[PDB]
Design a protein around this ligand. Structure first.
Ligand code: MG
Ligand code: MG
Ligand code: MG
Ligand code: MG
Ligand code: MG
Ligand code: MG
Ligand code: MG
Ligand code: MG
Ligand code: MG
Ligand code: MG
Ligand code: MG
Ligand code: MG
Ligand code: MG
Ligand code: MG
Ligand code: MG
Ligand code: MG
Ligand code: MG
Ligand code: MG
Ligand code: MG
Ligand code: MG
Ligand code: MG
Ligand code: MG
Ligand code: MG
Ligand code: MG
Ligand code: MG
Ligand code: MG
Ligand code: MG
Ligand code: MG
Ligand code: MG
Lengths: 150, 261, 201
RNA sequence: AUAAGGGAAGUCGGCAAAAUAGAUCCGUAACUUCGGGAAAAGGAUUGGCUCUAAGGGUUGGGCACGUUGCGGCGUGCGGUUAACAACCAACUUAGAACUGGUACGGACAGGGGGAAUCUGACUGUCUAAUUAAAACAUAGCAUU
RNA sequence: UACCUGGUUGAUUCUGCCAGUAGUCAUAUGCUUGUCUCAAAGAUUAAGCCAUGCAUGUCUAAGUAUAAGCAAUUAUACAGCGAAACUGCGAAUGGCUCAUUAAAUCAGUUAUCGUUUAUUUGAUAGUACCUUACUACAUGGAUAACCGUGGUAAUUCUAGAGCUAAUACAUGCUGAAAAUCCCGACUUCGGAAGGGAUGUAUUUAUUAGAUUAAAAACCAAUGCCCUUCGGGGCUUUCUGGUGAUUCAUAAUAACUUCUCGAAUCGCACGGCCUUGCGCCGGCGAUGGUUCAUUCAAAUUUCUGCCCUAUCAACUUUCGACGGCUGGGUAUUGGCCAGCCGUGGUGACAACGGGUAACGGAGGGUUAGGGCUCGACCCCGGAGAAGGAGCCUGAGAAACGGCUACUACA
RNA sequence: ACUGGCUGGGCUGGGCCUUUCCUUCUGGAGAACCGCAUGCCGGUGUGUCGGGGAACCAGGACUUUUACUCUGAACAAAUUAGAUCGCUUAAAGAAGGCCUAUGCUUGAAUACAUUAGCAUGGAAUAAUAGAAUAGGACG
């Protein structure tokens, strides 16, 4: 994503329990242990994006550098709107079977998901989403990977 | 609904209890305890409906009052006490011991066992870790917790319990080539040897077993009950849990009937 | 009373829901308690499951921690100076979590004098009003103290002026409405400089 | 100019008097030549004191040399300050706490409204000194 | 059991409807009525109104007994049965009904690494010092039942006077060592006497919670053994779990109108010796901190509900879509309070209006495909004339619990 | 009671070579084939053989994606179909039976539901992506 500055708000944003002003200097490879930026890997064969490791953004809803875990069902859909702030709307299509007429009909549903600043998503992109804890009234999913465009 | 329920309506009880649909409107409603409500064997049902020792309900609670019968070596004083898989009930006065174990048709049956070897059990571990103060501990399927275990023992294994001192005498690893019995699902009573295990990331793996008659079958890991690697430690009931189909079942009943008379 | 269910809201399509059931014992709410700085006053409340909570109405002291050294001493609170949520809360001297406050530096200065044998933030030398010296009854202390001073390091320039005045800025990290405690740590460095830049401009 | 209770029972007839009245925010029917009716009808707020927020102007931005006595220039050549620093200036709008004999467009200034019928389309004009109207005029139409 | 017949015309063949025929765990009604196995029944119209009687209490050898209570007469503190009453638990389970309700309830399938949890079952807590000491061979005041004296036509209404109990209420000490971090009286420069703290609960800050190919080279600080006296080396403690966490757990500096770490009760009768009311010693009721389990509960992912367009755009006054900081709740969350963006659903039927609509398992009718019913014995949800508010308690927004209004009485 | 046979008919495959055949690592485990000592009469049980390395197991790395179909797991008691037992038959019920017993023994099954969700094999039929300003594949 494109963010001009990290601190552009009334309060100060910082990762919880990450001590940042230490008198003694020690260099460690561990992300959060030594006192530098913290990150981990969610799993399910999903690789942490490179932009996360060196980025400076602060987010309490991103699956990376955040306090949210990815667990539950994993879904796919079609992106229809990405012009609001830190939230996307996805459309999923399927076929319902009517037994009496022995043929199908198409149906669709709309879904809302949270997009991390690590990724940059535009219209007409392939996405994979995973279940998470309630982040809002109608937001319960998080994007994990964006497939290349056709 | 303003709290938890305390009554269980007859015609809704588990099928393997074998309760007649007539002669009353209610069921024993086993009390809370160490075993799951869905798959348990109430002591009143076992004593009255299987052994036929007590005619009806009224004297059933009188029978326990003399403390003659005990389970797992410890006396229990509630009539609706949930007994379960592998549990051993001991009656000193008559001189025999019973273990609650599934038959080949998926219900509890009476099974005589010898007194000298009927004094130990074995159960699967649910989770292993260190508790307060750094002391490791494990909990089995019958709510037995034991601290300071063998560090090689891991989750999903089974451990042999003395039942008198609660010490870890022996254990069985969970791997291919072991002999297991299924404890949940439709495949009740089968006995097989673990062939191989393939896991799916995200939970709910499946395992494939094979019967003595070259049959093949699969079941969830939560439903497998390993009782040995070879020469199972416990004494299996008649039929060894092989589940011959109806063709041989029909052949054998007339075959033994004609042989006897 | 107050209810915290979502039934009375309206669905995301704009539809209006219909009456379903009366209010339930759970999903309830409680009257907020606005903590203020003054003589201590705490009330007990019997919460769900038979436990208890503590409504804090007035407090005057709490634990605050110095980051690098790692010491926590009980002291008194001077006043609240900033709150990211609402400005009217700030001046009325009402205290909640994540409230920037100002604290007395006497206990920390005395502990600093005892732990390290050097003076911190003294521009009263022009007045010489409170000059006093006590003979120290040993010689083994200097090698340990100079080792600590030469190893640990020196304090940043921002913090001694605050100790000279005797007041320090801090951020509350406790839950006054939930636990009845005002706890935090003294804030310093670039994170301090952000607040100093915002406070007076 | 003011009047207890009733509120047009007075009278040819509500003649005279009373009631509503500024600004901000809600809400607004039948009918219609779709422009109106509409300020329709009908409701809420309005002081003092102490604060917060928003709406502007002016002057400054790198090297590399040559005249003129640290400065105005002459130039050549890079970057768009992740917009900073100082000074100057009137009013208009929104929000909060406290306060009072619940009062606050405190004097002045300042629309009563609704349901229908007859008649002329409307604005306009005339009997100066008893009649301002349904009378006259008007655009439109038709004829010689 | 995959079936048809009568009716337009002077006569004929068709489309087309009217009539006949059969089933119904489908209701009402008429005539008639001997026996055997089983037995539904004020749902439909009025979720309209109710006289009368009942529907929730409870004791063991084992919480509290001075009944001017009975019965015996081994217990001069008692010992049986024990009225009454205090205390503990249940009374939130059962039973009835279907008014409202059209993504609401519900069904199948997932989840709680986002919470509470009576009871049952299994494990589990050196009060370091306070308070030399308060007594530890054991702390301190009320109250019931009760005697006796009253008020009102009236109730499961009560006053004042005199006594006494707790497993009611309120306080409070006794079986060890090692260890840890500060301060250090002391000076020789290496060291060293001594002081204090440290169970558990609560809240905040900080540290550890390792990996999974190897070989050198210095520099600074700068360890032993062997020893030739220059040196040769150099070898090296543990560290759990999930697909995934700030997880389980450990350590440091402090804090608290602040918990717990046992002043309870009864039936069976033994051992030692310095022989004193001396010491030690076995089975069970009523508890108690944390973990595990059981009965669960609240939220939560996906798909699936009748007719209607003479319902086509809806939502944000006074949250409608999302971001940030907080408050509140057992916890997440526009649930609420402030600031900043302008969003969200729809012809793939949104929104609204009707329903003589509780949903499902399922009933009736059959070649197959279907049509229709489902208040009602099984599961889930809601209600007790209509609205709201609340105490006790783990659990209630309870009505065989209380408060207030409206209508009846 | 009942065995052989028939280049019997197939039927389901499982290997091959045809320009195609089948990705990949580590670790465990571990036989076969030849041979050995001793037993014996050219190999074996020894195996505490070595030139070994079928097959398996536990773990790493990649593979167009849907629709579709086969086989599994999970899923309610009751009900429907349906097996057994002469309540004197039957509607029902899950009971009972056996010489003579101061005893023994069994049943109380099974398939379907069918929408959505979770795995496995097949790769026709119906959609989708890939190298053209090479921004393409390999060492
Ligand atoms: Mg899991
Ligand atoms: Mg008057
Ligand atoms: Mg008057
Ligand atoms: Mg009037
Ligand atoms: Mg009149
Ligand atoms: Mg008159
Ligand atoms: Mg007038
Ligand atoms: Mg008006
Ligand atoms: Mg009008
Ligand atoms: Mg005002
Ligand atoms: Mg006015
Ligand atoms: Mg007329
Ligand atoms: Mg006119
Ligand atoms: Mg005139
Ligand atoms: Mg005039
Ligand atoms: Mg009725
Ligand atoms: Mg009624
Ligand atoms: Mg007694
Ligand atoms: Mg009805
Ligand atoms: Mg317990
Ligand atoms: Mg008590
Ligand atoms: Mg749109
Ligand atoms: Mg209804
Ligand atoms: Mg029903
Ligand atoms: Mg029900
Ligand atoms: Mg209720
Ligand atoms: Mg109520
Ligand atoms: Mg009643
Ligand atoms: Mg009730």
């Amino acid at each position: 994503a494109t963010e001009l500055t990290v601190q552009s708000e009334r309060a100060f944003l910082k990762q919880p329990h990450i001590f940042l002003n230490s008198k003694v200097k020690v260099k460690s490879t561990r992300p959060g242990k030594g006192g530098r930026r913290w990150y981990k890997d969610v799993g399910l064969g999903f690789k942490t994006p490179k932009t996360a490791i060196e980025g400076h953004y602060i987010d309490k809803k991103c699956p990376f550098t955040g306090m949210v875990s990815i667990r539950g069902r994993i879904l796919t859909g079609r992106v229809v709107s990405t012009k609001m702030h830190r939230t996307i709307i996805i459309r999923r299509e399927y076929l319902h079977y009517i037994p009496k007429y022995n043929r199908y009909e198409k149906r669709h549903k709309n879904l809302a998901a949270h997009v991390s600043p690590a990724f940059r998503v535009e219209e007409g992109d392939m996405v994979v989403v995973g279940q998470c804890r309630p982040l809002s009234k109608t937001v319960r999913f998080n994007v994990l990977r964006v497939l290349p465009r056709t | 609904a303003r709290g938890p329920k305390k009554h269980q309506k007859r015609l809704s009880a588990p099928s393997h209890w074998l309760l007649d649909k007539l002669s009353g409107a209610y069921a024993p409603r086993p009390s809370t305890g160490p075993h799951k409500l869905r798959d348990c064997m109430p002591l009143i049902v076992f004593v009255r409906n299987r052994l036929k020792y007590a005619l009806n309900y009224r004297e059933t609670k009188a029978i326990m009052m003399q403390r003659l019968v005990k389970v797992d070596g410890k006396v229990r004083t509630d009539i609706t006490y949930p007994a379960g898989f592998m549990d051993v009930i001991t009656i000193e006065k008559t001189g025999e011991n019973f273990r609650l174990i599934y038959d080949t048709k998926g219900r509890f049956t009476v099974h005589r066992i010898t007194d000298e070897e009927a004094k130990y059990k074995l159960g699967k571990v649910k989770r292993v870790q260190l508790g307060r103060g750094g002391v490791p501990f494990l909990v089995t399927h019958d709510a037995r917790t034991i601290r300071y275990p063998d560090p090689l023992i891991k989750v999903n294994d089974t451990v042999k319990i003395d039942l008198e001192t609660g010490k870890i005498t022996d254990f069985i690893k969970f791997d291919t080539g072991a002999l297991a019995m299924i404890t949940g699902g439709r495949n009740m009573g089968r006995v097989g040897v673990i062939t191989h295990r393939e896991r799916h990331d995200g939970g709910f793996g499946i395992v494939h077993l094979k019967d003595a008659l070259d049959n093949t079958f699969a079941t969830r890991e939560s439903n497998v009950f390993v009782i040995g690697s070879e020469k199972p430690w416990i004494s299996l009931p008649k039929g060894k849990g092989v589940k011959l189909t109806i063709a041989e079942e029909r052949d054998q009943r007339r075959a033994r009937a004609l042989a006897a008379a | 009373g107050i209810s915290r269910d979502s039934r009375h809201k309206r669905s995301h399509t704009g539809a209006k829901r219909a009456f379903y059931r009366k209010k339930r014992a759970f999903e309830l709410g409680r009257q907020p308690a606005n903590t203020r700085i003054g003589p201590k006053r705490i009330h007990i409340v019997r919460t769900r499951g038979g436990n208890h909570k503590y409504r804090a109405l007035r407090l005057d002291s709490g634990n605050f921690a110095w980051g690098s050294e790692g010491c926590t001493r009980k002291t008194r609170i001077i006043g609240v100076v900033y709150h990211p949520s609402n400005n009217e809360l700030v001046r009325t001297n009402t205290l909640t979590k994540s409230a920037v406050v100002q604290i007395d530096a006497a206990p920390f200065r005395q502990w600093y004098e005892a732990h390290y044998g050097q003076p911190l933030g003294r521009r009263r030398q022009q007045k010489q009003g409170q000059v006093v010296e006590e003979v120290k009854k040993s010689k083994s202390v200097e090698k340990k103290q100079a080792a600590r001073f030469a190893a640990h390091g020196k304090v940043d320039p921002a913090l001694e002026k605050q100790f000279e005045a005797g007041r320090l800025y801090a951020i509350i990290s406790s839950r006054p409405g939930q636990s009845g405690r005002a706890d935090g740590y003294i804030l310093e460095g670039e994170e301090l400089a952000f607040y100093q830049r915002k406070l007076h401009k």
